[PDB]
Amino acid sequence: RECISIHVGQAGVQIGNACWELYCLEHGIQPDGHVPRAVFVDLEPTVIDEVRTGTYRQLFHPEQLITGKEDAANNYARGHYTIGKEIIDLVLDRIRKLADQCTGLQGFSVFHSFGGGTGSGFTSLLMERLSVDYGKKSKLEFSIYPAPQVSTAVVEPYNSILTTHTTLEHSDCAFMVDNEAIYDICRRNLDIERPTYTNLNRLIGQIVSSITASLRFDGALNVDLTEFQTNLVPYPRGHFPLATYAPVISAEKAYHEQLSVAEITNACFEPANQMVKCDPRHGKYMACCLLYRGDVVPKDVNAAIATIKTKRTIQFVDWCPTGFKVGINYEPPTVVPGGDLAKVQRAVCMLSNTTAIAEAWARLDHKFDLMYAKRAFVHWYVGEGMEEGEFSEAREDMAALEKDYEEVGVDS
Amino acid sequence: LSFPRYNVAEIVIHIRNKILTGADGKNLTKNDLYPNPKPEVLHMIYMRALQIVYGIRLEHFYMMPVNSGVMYPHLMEGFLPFSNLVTHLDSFLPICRVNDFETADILCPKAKRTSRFLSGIINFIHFREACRETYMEFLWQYKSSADKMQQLN
Amino acid sequence: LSFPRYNVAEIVIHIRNKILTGADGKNLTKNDLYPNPKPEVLHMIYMRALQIVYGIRLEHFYMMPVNSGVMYPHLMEGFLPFSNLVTHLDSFLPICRVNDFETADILCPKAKRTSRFLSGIINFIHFREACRETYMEFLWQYKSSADKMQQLN
Amino acid sequence: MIKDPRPLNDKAFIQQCIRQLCEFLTENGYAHNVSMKSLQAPSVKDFLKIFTFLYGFLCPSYELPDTKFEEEVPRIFKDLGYPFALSKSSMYTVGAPHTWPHIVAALVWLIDCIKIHTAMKESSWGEETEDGIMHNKLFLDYTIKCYESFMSGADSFDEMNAELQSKLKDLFNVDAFKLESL
Amino acid sequence: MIKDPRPLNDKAFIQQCIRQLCEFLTENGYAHNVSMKSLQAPSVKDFLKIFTFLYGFLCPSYELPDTKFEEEVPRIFKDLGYPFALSKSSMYTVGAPHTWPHIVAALVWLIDCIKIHTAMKESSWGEETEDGIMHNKLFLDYTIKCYESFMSGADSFDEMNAELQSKLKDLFNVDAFKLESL
Amino acid sequence: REIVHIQAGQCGNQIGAKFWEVISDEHGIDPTGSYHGDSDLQLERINVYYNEAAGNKYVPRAILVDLEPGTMDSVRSGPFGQIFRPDNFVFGQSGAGNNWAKGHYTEGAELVDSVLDVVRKESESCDCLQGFQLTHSLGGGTGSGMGTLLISKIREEYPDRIMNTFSVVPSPKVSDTVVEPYNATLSVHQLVENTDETYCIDNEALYDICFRTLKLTTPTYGDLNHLVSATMSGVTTCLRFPGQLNADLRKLAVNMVPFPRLHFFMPGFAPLTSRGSQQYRALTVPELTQQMFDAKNMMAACDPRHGRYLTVAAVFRGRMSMKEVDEQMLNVQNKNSSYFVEWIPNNVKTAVCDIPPRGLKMSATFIGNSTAIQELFKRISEQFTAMFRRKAFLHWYTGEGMDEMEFTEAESNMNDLVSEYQQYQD
């Protein structure tokens, strides 16, 4: 029934504090109410401390807040092997101590930031140690994969080609939200050149609320977590769909809010609104899980979608007749009291697997090579319990992820 | 099936002394022979043993039979040492008093069976040493009498 | 392996007296032979020893074998003394009653082993001195009788 | 052994592979019906029957352990010297469109091992040992013979020594009425 | 020995070096697969396997101590008489673009040592000693023979002295029925 | 986390006074007083530079190494001079001769053990050590020689903790010493092989940047020092503050050093406007990147425009949009694709603290790893040879127990170091 969550890496923790905020906010549980149902991991104390100093301070147990005073290191190796190792046990312990206390759970919603040290590496083995300790569950990892041109870390790809290959054979469904492609939404669909990280977080903090929160919440067309991976992954590769939200209108500027279904659903497939720089440049969808929430008439959907199924310029895979999982919830969304999110009475958090990422992975793989081609910051990992193996052998890994996402599509 | 002369600890010491060399022996430990034997460690031991006894080299473990007719010869060299290793162990282990050797012994070793084998080899190796002394003494006697021949003609 | 006749302190004194000369011997101290021997000090000792016994010179330690076929002969002279040193020590140490000498003894010396070697050399050196006296006495006897020959013809 | 020389994404080559597998199974008495058609996208259950059959030519009477095949099958290909790693997830989806080409290729490579190993059971020297033995073929004969005796409780080796001396007289023309007749 | 005569920054010469290394490894039974490709930028782990192999031709059964290779490898090249210092930091980055040319060069020089040393185990005189010995080849023979006897518990050396006098009569035609017959 | 500053030599020392003059105020620590901190955040992370004893006395955890009393006796007899525990003063009343050899082999080598002693007392302080900060000048004895030794020892004692080095490489135009290239070439040598992050500052790159970027007409040393100390505060201490995207010495190290040499950077501060007038506030952000990335404004002597970059780390510290930050960086990376090296898709390492420099609204430290610094070690290396050739003031070295092969060594080493760096400019 439940779904634990492990927010790993400063980012996965910032986003965590955010997604965790939106929660109580739409459940009437102020600062000090019940008890969360997740944990927080980081090898840099000062960040988890922010959850220990700032807002939502006492809504957590100093037990579900793991820290390694030591060093973060923007390098996979160190975070996965060398350092990150020391903490893992302890980490697990909570996701085994928190996993027990419950009643027939469904899985762990993992929150990490692909291209980091504590986020890429660590998790790599966290999800790793999970796939074995609970192979019998769902492993949906919600990632924030590398901005297409606006990356931060100098190594980023090293850290992301490595978190992909190690987690690939362990996740159930990996959701992806592109940090940059979300900015566009903040520039083009909300207008603000002042987007603090605290915003992107409010956003995913939204799209995510549509996943677990409301879905695990009764409705006219419930959709379990398992449901996802089933209706969402055509193949064992921990396939990565993309998150998209519909009413991303500004709560100040424009106001046409009352945008009946027929509209908000069409607003999902236009590439300028998908929290991912993977513009459907060719990527044929192969399965979409349209999660609606608020006042929505099933016919409105079983029509708004029909209209789409016949737009053709939206070309769905061949081997897939119908790939539209319609998830209907009741309670409308719940916008921050005064952030910058419109606040409509219905939304569409549609996520999907698109042959599109054939790109995004490509463009991120290429990156890697360029540097590896010169070993660039390699000495930083080797000296951290890794080898020419793990790199070269994780490169070959993704290689067959560029072929995979190619074969499962583009062909009939 | 009598009891093996040696347990794993002793077996390591005899392999170091008599079969493996330098780094190879120094790296060899109990845990890569029991309770689950690392097939690639046994490969090295069984191979070195054969080399010592039959005077044979690494290269001989890469011989390709002529009537195989495979399509990609270069893709098969990973398998050659196994195939040859098996063919020779067929002939050698009966000498070391082991008659029930099977291909699965190389591909998927069991603790007790492989400790029985290594004892049999180690035993035989101690015996041929005793024979070497006798043999080399006779050899020195005849090649020295073949010299007192050319020194007399 | 019996016990070496001398400990390091005595070994230094015998090397000064019988093998090294002037500055070379004066510089020689316990700590460059134990507990970790300075390979270049042993090089000098082993080399001088060979010179004394075989009547051989520094130049002989720079002989290049003819069928080597190296690309940069002048870049190899650092190695030549080592290679030759080893080739001769192969023949000499068995004479000084040392049979287990190995190349690593020059490149990477151990305290006890090298003190065993230096004792064996020092021992042999004392013995050939005793033989020198006997030999030179016979030599003086025969080259003096070869003179009483030309003084009589 | 690093980059695959094989045209794995050429239809004809994958079709050639399937043909070889089909042929081999049929010609070696495989118990279940197979055809070019039935081998285009086998079920995992099928694959495991086929793999078990082929591998049984190398390990007689072999059955794969009842769980963890996704670990075992790849391990076996590794231990046989297959130059290319087979992923855990390949194993769950062996018959899938972008997967079967790699797997059928692997099976046909295994078939090639069988061929090599079968030829090896017909025909495929070391005269000196690296611990100072000369005429090793003579020493081994001597040593083996002594061992049989020893293993029979024998305390001395006169028979074996006598025979060794006979052969050593012939290897270097020498005895008594030769070395002292001169 | 001071300034390197070798064209270390000529691609062809570094390629020539790699070729020599590749050839040598393959032709001397090196256990791991190597190719012109695999040797362009080896890992430190690889380098250490390659170095250990090569050096083992000089120090049989050699393994490098389990820590401090960055100190050891350079020390060994120094003690072998390599004219050029190899830095501690070279050792951590052996395969790196501006480093491998120096290191491959060093390995090929080591290979040349092996060649020199192997030839030396075939073929490569001192008739007078610098402490007054004349006919040292005769003295050494005498001295060695006396030592064997001595080392056997012998107290006198009549056999050896007698043999020495035989040879000294032949070196200067002289005895008794010669020096007094005149 | 933590660090332990090291004031090697006079310069490195003089600067200590300025680095601590600043940092303290950027942490509300009065002379011997405690934390008067205008806020409450300038305390949760102080540890990085102090120690708890009394309860109002957080003492700087640095080391003051010098063979010239008068110096430390000027730093200890002035302003903040009375905050260092006397134990910190590792003096060498000997003759602090201006010889690299006199402070590295003969005179300094003695005072070393009595230093390492303390560098251990401070390291084994508490919690977890990160690395050590090192200030000095590569143009003197107590600086290049003795300080370059202090590290060679430090890096043997904790090859784990990092080593940032702040070197005052010998300014071009005019050398404030004569053997300079001797004391220098010899210290850079030691650097390229121990510390793993070096920030090279040039007394004349400063003047310039201080007389034209600050209409400042009488730039006393105190100033230069002050400007420098401003950058080293943005680097370390800063990142030991919260941030949307924070980093720390390692991130900085693990994102800036592609190849183990250690590589040297060139720090640049953001708001560098003259007092009154200039107080333009054009600091929205494009104004900071405008700044930081221009030629002038690089504390180094060389000009970036003269050679690609390998890495860059804009360590900003003042509330801004992870969008207008992450964005700007890009255009910057495209307007100058020319010089920014290619085999690194994203050279830049954007870092973002929150709280800014006490009195300012928005700043951003720049730590550039450009190939341009090739054209400096060249300089140095040249000066050497031109004088080495004639063994100029060499007797002051050898006569101090040195080697004719020692100088050879360094030059070459550091000389090769020039070579390599070009391997990427191409």
Ligand SMILES: CC(=O)O[C@H]1C(=O)[C@@]2(C)[C@H]([C@H](OC(=O)c3ccccc3)[C@]3(O)C[C@H](OC(=O)[C@H](O)[C@@H](NC(=O)c4ccccc4)c4ccccc4)C(C)=C1C3(C)C)[C@]1(OC(C)=O)CO[C@@H]1C[C@@H]2O
């Ligand atoms: C009324 C007002 O706003 O005054 C400003 C000011 O006029 C200006 C010109 C300051 C001023 O700085 C200088 O004039 C300066 C003098 C020598 C060397 C370098 C700089 C200022 O003195 C410097 C001072 O800086 C700080 O307070 C920072 O926290 C800074 N602190 C110190 O450097 C410091 C100085 C003395 C004692 C202790 C610390 C800092 C920067 C980075 C990291 C840590 C601390 C500021 C904003 C100002 C004055 C006071 C006029 C500027 O510099 C800095 C470092 O902020 C020079 O260009 C900037 C722009 C500022 O607006």
Ligand SMILES: Nc1nc2c(ncn2[C@@H]2O[C@H](COP(=O)(O)OP(=O)(O)OP(=O)(O)O)[C@@H](O)[C@H]2O)c(=O)[nH]1
């Ligand atoms: N959406 C979003 N992205 C973030 C946030 N914080 C960081 N990121 C992104 O995630 C990546 C940063 O990872 P880091 O913060 O460097 O590292 P980490 O993953 O927390 O772990 P360490 O490297 O060990 O510190 C960059 O690509 C950032 O753009 C956040 O709050 N929200």
Ligand SMILES: Nc1nc2c(ncn2[C@@H]2O[C@H](COP(=O)(O)OP(=O)(O)O)[C@@H](O)[C@H]2O)c(=O)[nH]1
């Ligand atoms: N920025 C700066 N440079 C200094 C200071 N003091 C000396 N220098 C520089 O340091 C060099 C001289 O070395 P010095 O510090 O006297 O050496 P030491 O005292 O013997 O270790 C010259 O290049 C000076 O410009 C200072 O307070 N600030």
Ligand SMILES: [Mg+2]
């Ligand atoms: Mg972090």
Ligand SMILES: [Zn+2]
């Ligand atoms: Zn409206």
